Amino acid sequence: RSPTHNGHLLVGALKRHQNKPVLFLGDTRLTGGQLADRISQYIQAFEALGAGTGVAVGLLSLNRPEVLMIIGAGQARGYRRTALHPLGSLADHAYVLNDAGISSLIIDPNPMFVERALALLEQVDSLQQILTIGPVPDALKHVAVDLSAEAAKYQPQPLVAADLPPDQVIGLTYTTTGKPKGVIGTAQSIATMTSIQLAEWEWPANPRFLMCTPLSHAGAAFFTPTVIKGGEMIVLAKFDPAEVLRIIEEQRITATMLVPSMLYALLDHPDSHTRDLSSLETVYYGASAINPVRLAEAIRRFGPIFAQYYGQSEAPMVITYLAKGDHDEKRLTSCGRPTLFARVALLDEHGKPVKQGEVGEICVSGPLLAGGYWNLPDETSRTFKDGWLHTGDLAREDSDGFYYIVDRVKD
Amino acid sequence: LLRSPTHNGHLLVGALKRHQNKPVLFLGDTRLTGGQLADRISQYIQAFEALGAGTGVAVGLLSLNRPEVLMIIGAGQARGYRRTALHPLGSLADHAYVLNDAGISSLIIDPNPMFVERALALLEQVDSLQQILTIGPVPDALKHVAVDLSAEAAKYQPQPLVAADLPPDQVIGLTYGKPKGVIGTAQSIATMTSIQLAEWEWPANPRFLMCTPLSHAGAAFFTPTVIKGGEMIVLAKFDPAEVLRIIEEQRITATMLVPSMLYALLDHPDSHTRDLSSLETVYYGASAINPVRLAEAIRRFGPIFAQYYGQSEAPMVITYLAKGDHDEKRLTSCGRPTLFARVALLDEHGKPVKQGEVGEICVSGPLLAGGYWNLPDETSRTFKDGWLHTGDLAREDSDGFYYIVDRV
Known part of the structure; x- marks a missing residue:
């Protein structure tokens, strides 16, 4: 009766599609088996570096092929990981790391993050080592170790997922004008989110996903479902509207996730009128973010391929969901319809x-x-x-069931 | 209740609310919408509890395919009534044992002569059987012991449909050497539904065709169909000509076809006459399959077929063959094991x-x-x-396909 966690699903999906390419990253095509082997090697390295089981590890990186290998390692064996935001402040980064008791910091070795790592070593007392995904820079020479090279030294072993308790803390999301609170990510919570994504979200068959967003923060949230459904993920390290539209045309992208800014940029680009984006079936986007009028323009220009999701850090991504066909003029201000897999209600001050x-x-x-x-x-x-x-979001409901986020309790 | 899981009825009630005006059930003339169904389900709940066939009471179901069967099922899904469906053409011995073991006090029957004779005989055998529940006007030979459940429900006013929060391991069903009753828990069934929605290749808004009994398997397809935004056209009986007609006329996109039914459809003049292009996903795999006929079906209609496998102990989602995975070598496969549950071929020691x-x-x-x-x-x-231990022995393929070879 023991529940299976996200790692079980991911490891199994990579095995299922051992010869099927699941990852595309510029010049790095990885198949399910290729990725699994690299994840196994990373696991070996992590445990030997003192950044494995029982160790809180941090992640400050941009979109790279290795990011998903690190994520996969933490998914399989339940490593407590905390993702640092690329454009976050030093003070906030320090608080987060100290609060989580982070001992090792995996950074992308670019000058900015190198400087941050050095500064964090001073402030964060729990920070002992730095893991560089790529050759150690000389500024971090005496404090960092190439994690990628250590993994290469190791041998690909059969990928296994650690059987973890449902309440096992496998993650800490901090994310305000105040102190970031560490939302405890349990194995069960993440597994539930994934299940609801696959059961309620309109996932295209064999999703060809375009990841234009940070993997450090939303990689597993889309990659795992994509490959469970037998899909491929082309990850962009940078966002260039022209390139994006071109990729959709060339690689026949069926699914993607856009933020307000990205949507607007694509809409405003002259190539959106020229490129064939007929392959696009489901464009996911977040709640309380995209201007309704720009969204209407998008629907009129590219079809109703847009789907809204709403969630918090305390209830990840699947509280409400607006379907592509439910994108009506009235529902452009709606966050979506409450899920059935969770009890969602609108309560008052007394809780009624x-x-x-x-x-x-x-x-x-x-x-x-x-x-x-x-x-x-x-x-x-x-x-x-x-x-x-108690989410802290105020909302109303129409006769059909759609929730319409008005404001916040704070407001 | 902070982190307590939801059950199948939560999903059912919620789906009927999401599609309150969208037609959801289609048996002949009865085209009920989500809201209409919910109203009837509520009225049935009220009648059940009043007649002493609700919470805490073990109820039985001996019916064919009526639109009211789904209302009865929905009542038991929402409130967690332990229901034990009796097989239409089952033997008296089987039926008696089942009812006796379960403690069945009320028997919901379709009032056809066969089932009323069975009802009387079971009353004489099973002594725990107190009353009978006729779906429709009580027959005179049952008038001394049976109540028109339908009329009773009609008296009540449609109330808002609610799903009783049930504990994960609440016995909400009993599915039956001698027939052993598997303990269907709320969690087990909810897990099955979630895996169906996730792993199975459900078409967009499935126009499901149910040529199979609503008892035993109806809920397992109805609930997912309506969660996916679709509706269920249910046939009262399996008649090949009718099935072919419906596929064409009502643009059926999804159908559960047990081996026998599929073979009959293949060998029919109307298979060539009617259009079957609308069909996208045929679910099959109730009781094995013949790879020869599978090949001929794929040759004729394309790879639009999908095999599921699961025992009473593990509902219907142990393994699953995908439509595109149906190769010539994979006609004997039962499918690849689910990712959502730990399915492993073990040894004598469990290795x-x-x-x-x-x-x-x-x-x-x-x-x-x-x-x-x-x-x-x-x-x-x-x-x-x-x-x-399912009792099935299988063999792993290079890709991971399980190949059921033998049984203990």
């Missing part, structure tokens, strides 16, 4: 369900919920309370 | 066998059922090995 039409607070209940806040019991008890996670 | 070695299909995960009704020895033997 509001009437349909009234503005209430989105509240979620189910195993999608995260474990709480890292070493913050009071905040956990004030957010996850009375059998409900 | 994972080699690729090319014959082992026992063993399933670990929330999918596996509770055990066996009042059969502790069998719970410890079939289940409780840390896995689930």
Whole structure:
């Protein structure tokens, strides 16, 4: 009766598609087996470097082929990972690392992150070693070790996924004008999110996914589902509207995830009128972000291929979902319809369900919920309370069931 | 209830609410929408509890294919009524044993002469059987013991449909040497549904055709169909000509066809006459398959077929053959094991066998059922090995395909 975690699903999918290319990264095509072998080698390196099981490891990297190998290692064996934001502040990075007790920092060896690593070594006392994915820079010569080279020294072994408890903390998302709170990512929570993605989101058969967004933060969230459904993922390291539209035309991209900025840029590009983007079946996009009028323009120009998802860090990505066919003029301001795999309700100040039409607070209940806040019991008890996670988002509901996010409780 | 899982009824109620105005059920003249179905389901719930056939009461189901069967099923799905479906053409001995073991107090029957004679005979055998529940006007020979469940439900007013929050391991069903009743738990069934929606190749808005009994397997296809935004055209009986007609007329995109039914469709003059292009995903795999006829079906209609495999102990999602994975060598395969559950071919000691070695299909995960009704020895033997001994022996292919060779 023991639940399977994300690692089980990922390892198995890579084995299922051992000869099928699952990753494309500029000049790096990896098949399922190729990726699995590299992930196994990375695991070996991690454990030998003292950045494996039982160790909190950080990640400050841009889109690289190795990022997904690191992610896969942490998925399989349940390494507690904390992703640092590329454009985050030193103070915030320090807080995050110190709070999570991060001992090793995997960085992309570019000048900016090299400087950050050095500075963090001073502030973060738990930070001992730096792992560089790529030849160690001379500024970090005495404090860093090429993790990629260590992995290459190791031998590809059969990839296995550690059987972890459902409540095993496998991640800490911090993400304000205040101290970042570490949302406890449990094995169960992530597995639930993935299951709902595959069960409710309109995933194209064999999704040809275009990842134009940070892998450090949303890689596993799309890669795992893509390859479970037998798909390929072309990851862009940079966003150039022309290039993106060209890739869709050439590689016949069926699925992608865009942010407001990306959508607007594509819309405004002259090549969007020229390139054939008929292959695009499902474009995922986030909640409370894309201007309704620009979204309408997009629907009129490229078809209703757009699908909105809404989630928090306490309830990752699948609270609500707006379908492509449900993208009507009225629902351009809607975040979507509540999931069935989790109990979602609009409650008032007293915690009683509001009437349909009234503005209430989105509240979620189910195993999608995260474990709480890292070493913050009071905040956990004030957010996850009375059998409900209190999102802090205010919303109303129409006669059909669509939630319309008005504001925040804070507001 | 912070992190408590949801059950199949939560999904069912929610889907009927999402599609409150979208036609969802189609049996002959009865074209009920999601909201209409929900209303009837509520009325049925009210009647069930009043007649003493609701919560805490073991109920039985001996019916054919009526639109009311789905309302009865929906009631038990939402509130967790332990239902035990009796096989239409089952023997008296089987039926009696099933009812006696389960403790069936009320028997919902389709009021056709055969089932009313069976009802009377079962009343005499099973003494726990107190009352009968006729779906429709009570026959005179049953008038002394049966109630028109349909009329009872009609008295009640449609109430908002709610799904009773049930514990993960709540016995919500009992599926039956001597027939052993598998303990269907809320969790097990919910897991099955989730895997169906995720791994199975459901077409966009499945226009499902149900030429199979709504009892036993109806919910397992209806719920996913309506979650995917589709509707179910259910045939009262399997008649090849009719099936072919519906595929053409009502643009059927999905159909569960057991081996026998598929063979009959193949050998029909109307298979050449009617259009079958609308058909996208044919689910099959109830009871094995003949690779020869599989080949001929793929030759005629394309690779639009999909094989599922699963025992009573692990619903219907152990392995799954994909439409495109149906190769000439893979006509004998049962499919590749699911990623969402730990399926491994084990040895005598329980050691994972080699690729090319014959082992026992063993399933670990929330999918596996509770055990066996009042059969502790069998719970410890079939289940409780840390896995689930299905009793099937299979062989792994290079790609991972399981090839059922033999059975213990």
